[PDB]
């Protein structure tokens, strides 16, 4: 039960339910750290959408330019 | 950049950084849905700790009785 989980400190490292469907940007940055094709890969994902890397729920295609997609990819890749 | 990510709606489905190291309970429940040994498995994980199912950061052993471990497992398995 939930009150026992709280009183035991469990909720310091767990949530009940994921608050966001997509991966956290720092986790994306870590997965793709050290890869020369990461910006091109991600900029295309962000623009066209995709599924199956992190799970089965898809990212819909996003309303960004190629420029904006590239920049978002560069920014996410710097997150730490 | 971050302001473009916000203005594009990206933060509806992403965080910058994971807020918790461990999996969300609803995700645990889904992974283990439909398994007769799930309560025994999880009660042991919660009590003894573990790593490598969700990632490499370990769950330390937790200060719970066997009773409490079993109940926490039963509760997490009901989360949806
Ligand atoms: C607004 C322009 C953005 C930007 C910059 C990003 N997203 Fe998403 N995203 C969502 C889901 C469900 C996933 C996982 C897809 C899969 O499992 O393959 C993602 C993934 C990403 C990534 C990583 C891509 C990869 O192949 O590793 C990145 C860099 C990313 N997104 C950026 C879900 C959503 C949304 C839900 C409705 C929304 C809105 C966005 N994402 C928006 C954006
Ligand atoms: C307080 C008593 C609890 C309870 C009920 C649970 N946890 Fe944790 N947990 C943490 C990490 C990093 C993981 C992943 C471990 C790996 O990758 O194998 C987990 C995992 C779990 C599970 C799922 C276990 C499985 O094998 O699928 C469950 C049911 C669970 N925990 C319950 C991290 C932490 C903590 C960080 C310091 C703390 C505190 C807890 N967990 C506490 C608890």
């Amino acid at each position: 039960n939930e009150q026992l989980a709280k009183q035991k400190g469990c909720m310091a490292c767990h949530d009940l339910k994921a608050k966001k469907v997509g991966p956290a940007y720092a986790d994306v940055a870590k997965k793709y750290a050290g890869r020369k094709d990461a910006v091109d890969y991600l900029a295309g994902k962000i623009k066209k959408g995709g599924s199956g890397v992190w799970g089965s729920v898809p990212m819909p295609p996003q309303n960004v330019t190629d420029a904006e997609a590239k920049q978002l990819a560069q920014w996410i890749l710097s997150i730490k």
Side-chain angles (χ1 to χ4, degrees), chain A:
Chain A
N1 67 104
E2 174 162 17
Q3 159 171 100
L4 173 64
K6 279 150 68 140
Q7 291 181 348
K8 290 297 185 161
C10 310
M11 319 304 299
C13 295
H14 302 275
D15 275 337
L16 296 184
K17 279 204 208 182
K19 307 307 161 40
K20 304 287 176 71
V21 299
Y25 294 151
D27 294 327
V28 174
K30 166 67 213 191
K31 170 158 180 103
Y32 298 103
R35 302 164 74 82
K36 262 173 102 163
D37 63 344
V39 167
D40 291 347
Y41 175 77
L42 304 180
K45 287 284 181 304
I46 290 168
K47 199 173 150 95
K48 296 169 312 193
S51 53
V53 183
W54 300 80
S56 87
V57 180
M59 177 160 45
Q62 298 295 304
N63 180 34
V64 294
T65 62
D66 283 352
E68 284 162 342
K70 183 176 168 204
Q71 198 168 37
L72 288 158
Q74 291 175 315
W75 167 64
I76 282 168
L77 285 168
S78 295
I79 296 177
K80 25 161 50 169

